[PDB]
Amino acid sequence: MALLGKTLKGRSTRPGGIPQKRNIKWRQLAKNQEEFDQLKQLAKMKREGLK
Amino acid sequence: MYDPNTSQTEKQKQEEFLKLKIQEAFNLFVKDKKGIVDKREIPYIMRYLGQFPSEAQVRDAILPEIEEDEPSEFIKYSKFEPYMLKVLKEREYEPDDPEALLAAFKLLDQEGKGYIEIDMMKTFLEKQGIEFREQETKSFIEFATNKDPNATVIYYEDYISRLQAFTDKHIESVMKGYNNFQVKK
Amino acid sequence: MPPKKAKGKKKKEEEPDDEYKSMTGADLTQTLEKLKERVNEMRTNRNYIQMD
Questions:
Q1: Residue among B117, B98, B96 at smallest CA distance from B108
Q2: CA nearest A49 in C: which residue?
Q3: DSSP C1-52
Q4: Is the CB of C9 inside 8 Å of chain B's CB atoms?
Q5: CA–CA gap between residue B109 and residue B101 (Å, rounded)
Q6: β-pairing, B74-76 with B36-38?
């Protein structure tokens, strides 16, 4: 149930230098949903003005 | 009826409306105590929930599932509402496609003349498959023949059209209020 | 035999980002007034041309 070797791994991607950044964007979720819940609704009522 | 591919809020609204409709149907069949209905009425309620289960199907599957650990002559609402909800969501016993009924009737009409004799229909319904009772056959003959006392043959096309229209009207009437219904918090 | 239609995933359409997503309520009442009678200017042009 374990003597299988069908899987073949991918390549050996070379990429080099520039590393990860610091902790910057942790508190930016203040208005993530609200804007999506607001910007969408701000003009989502623009259709009963049609029928 | 119940849409199984709508939004989560729509899913909850549909489930609540279906539960309320099942409760209303149960109350319509409630005679002595709320929460218990006669076993014989189990398929009948399904026919308002959009399900047309066969007698054999209900006896073999519906009855054992609805029945509690011990066989009881009355089905409690507690074991009736959830099973009804899942059955309706799965559309297990929904009536077949009207095209299927037309194909069956044309198969019955070997010559393809567009009509079937009343005696032939009676023999087919009373000798093959799950035989109908006398009142079942009488009602089927009366309503297929639009309550015509002088009718000698039944035209399957118009009878099927009328039955489908009546079923659609009944379903819409029973579904009435879903737009105004809201999820209870 | 019946080839049962595949239970394809329902619409749940992503609302197009067309011009319908611009302004708030009061200007929606104004736009209302801006497309509330006339389109039957056109339907009535249809009707009168049909009568002729």
A1: B117
A2: C32
A3: ---PPP------PPPP-STTSS--HHHHHHHHHHTSSTHHHHHHHHHHHHH-
A4: yes
A5: 12
A6: antiparallel
Vertex B170: Cα angle to B148 and B103 (nearest 5): 65
Query: Is C10 in contact with B3 (Cβ distance < 8 A)?
Result: yes
* Torsion angle of the four alpha carbons B146, B151, B157, B158, in this order, in degrees rounded to the nearest 10: -30
B182 touches chain C (CB under 8 A): no
Beta-carbon contacts of B26 under 8 Å, excluding residues fewer than 6 positions away, are B35, B37, B45, B77, B80, B81
Work out the minimum CA distance from B8 to partner chain C, whole angstroms.
11
Q: How far apart are the CA of C51 and the nearest CA of chain B, in angstroms?
A: 35
Task: Please check whether residue B100 touches C, CB under 8 A.
Answer: yes
Give the technique used to solve this structure: cryo-EM
Of B6, B97, B100, the CB nearest to C10: B6
Ranges of H-type helices in B49-155: 55-57, 63-66, 77-90, 98-108, 118-127, 134-144
> In units of Å, what resolution does this entry have?
7.4
- Determine the residue of chain C that is closest to B96 in CA distance: C2
Is C22 in contact with A46 (Cβ distance < 8 A)? yes
- Closest Cα to residue B183, out of B21, B12, B19? B12
In whole angstroms, give the CA distance from residue B28 to residue B1.
20
Residue B36 Cα distances to A45, B26, B104, C26, angstroms: 47, 8, 38, 55
Contacts of A47 in chain C (CB under 8 A): 20
List the one residue out of B62, B49, B55 whose CA is nearest residue B89.
Answer: B49
Q: Which residues of C11-49 are buried (b: 16+ CB within 10 A; e: fewer)?
A: eeeeeeeeeebeeeeeebeebeeeeeeeeeeeeeeeeee
